[PDB]
Design a protein around this ligand. Structure first.
Ligand SMILES: Nc1ccc2c(c1)c(-c1ccccc1)[n+](CCCCCCc1cnnn1CCNc1c3c(nc4ccccc14)CCCC3)c1cc(N)ccc21
Length: 537
């Protein structure tokens, strides 16, 4: 042990770890990468809840990111930064249950607020080791302890035969919960305050954060939550038990597996990981965007009822949440199989291409409901205009899947006692490689929250760097105090809480905070109040 940095040896419940001193623009940070938190969910453990990592002897090397959970690697535009940056940057393995910790260097003398990141990727992809989730900046600049975990995705994480012992569903959420217990027991060793833990996440990550809010055992493992561009309620983040059974069964069938649940699961198990991935998209009931095959299941266990029912009837008195959306939630989804759309042209579509796109975006919808969406999203002054049709298509997808589900999460937590803060993120990164027409696409605020623009080698404007500092300040102020506003700062414009009466939220851009009212109030009344009833009859 004798000749290495004394500031990088830490013990956890499972044994000794050696971390790595990393360089950040302002100075050094401690990182402890690839800490096993669960027994490898391999072999007979596939589809099964995670078991706590057994203790090891000797010093575990925690200097590098560990394997990414098995997943479909995106190949829409091979070589393209815009898609590759989300693709796994470590080898794929079922042995993937590891978490990462960044802390100031030297580690803080007094108990520090902890941020826990949960990545998105439609519950079928993603990794805590992606460049855009690098905790070094928040660690260094804000003095925060940042934890991020891998969790199982796709079949391995969410395939369920509800009611069975061998494949209960929701195990990917259980991986996340186990990483949270790991933080409770171990984060004090790194100088984190386990009594001050904020979850934050984007997309499926946000939806996950939301499910932890709505699940009893998880509630005791954190104090605050941030949901970025995603919600537990909504059309994509969950499935009924019935539907999850249908999908598991169909996939079983597609890989050559037959009648009860034990035999079926044993057979799946058995199957090479790649075979499962290769067939997962085939189980979707309709041609669709923003829908994913294997997602959290309403099991009557982890989720005791539908997220809708739980937000309508829950008590959220002691909760504080920060929630928000980006300007162009839907645009990215269009290039993934809406005919008409491409990254390499303006995507000026036709009316036919729009009606076709609406069916794909609202899958789900009877002929009448589709007519409603179309009528509501058509500009009747220019009903044939390709620019507007392209933007309406984007908005349809963005509104239905993200903006409007966020609109109620907020309105609904607020009506039941939560302190809520809402934002629209409106800045397009100067470094962004998607075309202009896509505006500010799903996921493109994360790099700012994590303070990447502070890395001078990244070529961000000045400007964008000051902006990244502001957001980091809002987020860690929220983590620290349940309120993004600067306590001492007299002059800087206030971020008011979202309420049902005033419906206030802020724009996050290069200009100072501007308070707007109503989150697409008029349009979200369509998706949240009218469409459901139209779908009944
Ligand atoms: N021929 C085949 C064979 C197998 C599969 C195929 C196609 C497709 C497909 C590809 C193109 C068009 C239509 C379908 N998808 C569906 C992909 C749909 C992905 C939608 C975009 C998205 C949403 N959340 N995560 N992602 C994946 C990419 N990661 C991103 C992320 C984020 N933001 C963005 C923004 C732009 C581009 C990507 C992206 C932010 C959060 C995390 C990931 C699959 C999905 C599967 N689970 C398995 C197989 C296949």
């Amino acid at each position: 042990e004798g000749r290495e940095d004394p500031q990088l040896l830490v013990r956890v419940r499972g044994g000794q770890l050696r971390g790595i001193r990393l360089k950040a623009p302002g100075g050094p940070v401690s990182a402890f990468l690839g800490i096993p938190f669960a027994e490898p969910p391999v072999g007979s453990r596939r589809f099964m809840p995670p078991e706590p990592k057994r203790p090891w002897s000797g010093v575990l090397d925690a200097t590098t990111f560990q394997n990414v959970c098995y997943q479909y690697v995106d190949t829409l535009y091979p070589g393209f930064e815009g898609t590759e940056m989300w693709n796994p940057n470590r080898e794929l393995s079922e042995d993937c249950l590891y978490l990462n910790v960044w802390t100031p260097y030297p580690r803080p003398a007094s108990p520090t607020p902890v941020l826990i990141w949960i990545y998105g990727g439609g519950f079928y992809s993603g990794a805590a080791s992606l460049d855009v989730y690098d905790g070094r900046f928040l660690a260094q600049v804000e003095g925060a302890v940042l934890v991020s975990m891998n969790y199982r995705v796709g079949t391995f994480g969410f395939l369920a035969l509800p009611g069975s012992r061998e494949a209960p569903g929701n195990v990917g959420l259980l991986d996340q919960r186990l990483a949270l217990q790991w933080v409770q027991e171990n984060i004090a060793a790194f100088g984190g305050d386990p009594m001050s833990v904020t979850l934050f996440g984007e997309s499926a990550g946000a939806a996950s954060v939301g499910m932890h809010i709505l699940s009893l055992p998880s509630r005791s493992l954190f104090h605050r939550a941030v949901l970025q561009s995603g919600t537990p309620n909504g059309p994509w983040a969950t499935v009924s038990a019935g539907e999850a059974r249908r999908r598991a069964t169909l996939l079983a069938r597609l890989v050559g597996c037959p009648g009860n649940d034990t035999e079926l699961i044993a057979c799946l198990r058995t199957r090479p990981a790649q075979d499962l991935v290769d067939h997962e998209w085939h189980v979707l009931p309709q041609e669709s965007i923003f829908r994913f095959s294997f997602v959290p299941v309403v099991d009557g266990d982890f989720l005791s009822d539908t997220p809708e029912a739980l937000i309508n009837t829950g008590d959220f008195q002691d909760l504080q949440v920060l929630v928000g959306v980006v300007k162009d939630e839907g645009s990215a989804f269009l290039v993934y199989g809406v005919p008409g759309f491409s990254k390499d042209n303006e995507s000026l579509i036709s009316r036919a291409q729009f009606l076709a796109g609406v069916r794909i975006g609202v899958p789900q919808a009877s002929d009448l409901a589709a007519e409603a969406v179309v009528l509501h999203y058509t500009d009747w002054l220019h009903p044939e205009d390709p620019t507007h049709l392209r933007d309406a298509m984007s908005a349809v997808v963005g509104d239905h899947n993200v903006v409007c589900p966020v609109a109620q999460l907020a309105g609904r937590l607020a009506a039941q006692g939560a302190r809520v803060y809402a934002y629209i993120f409106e800045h397009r990164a100067s470094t962004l490689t998607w075309p202009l027409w896509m505006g500010v696409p799903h996921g493109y605020e994360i790099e700012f929250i994590f303070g990447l623009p502070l890395d001078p080698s990244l070529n961000y404007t000045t400007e964008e760097r000051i902006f990244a500092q502001r957001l980091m300040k809002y987020w860690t102020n929220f983590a620290r105090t349940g309120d993004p506003n600067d306590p001492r700062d007299s002059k800087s414009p206030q971020w008011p809480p979202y309420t049902t009466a005033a419906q206030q939220y802020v724009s996050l851009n290069l200009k100072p905070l501007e308070v707007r009212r109503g989150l697409r109030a008029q349009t979200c009344a369509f998706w949240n109040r009218f469409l459901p009833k139209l779908l009944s009859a």
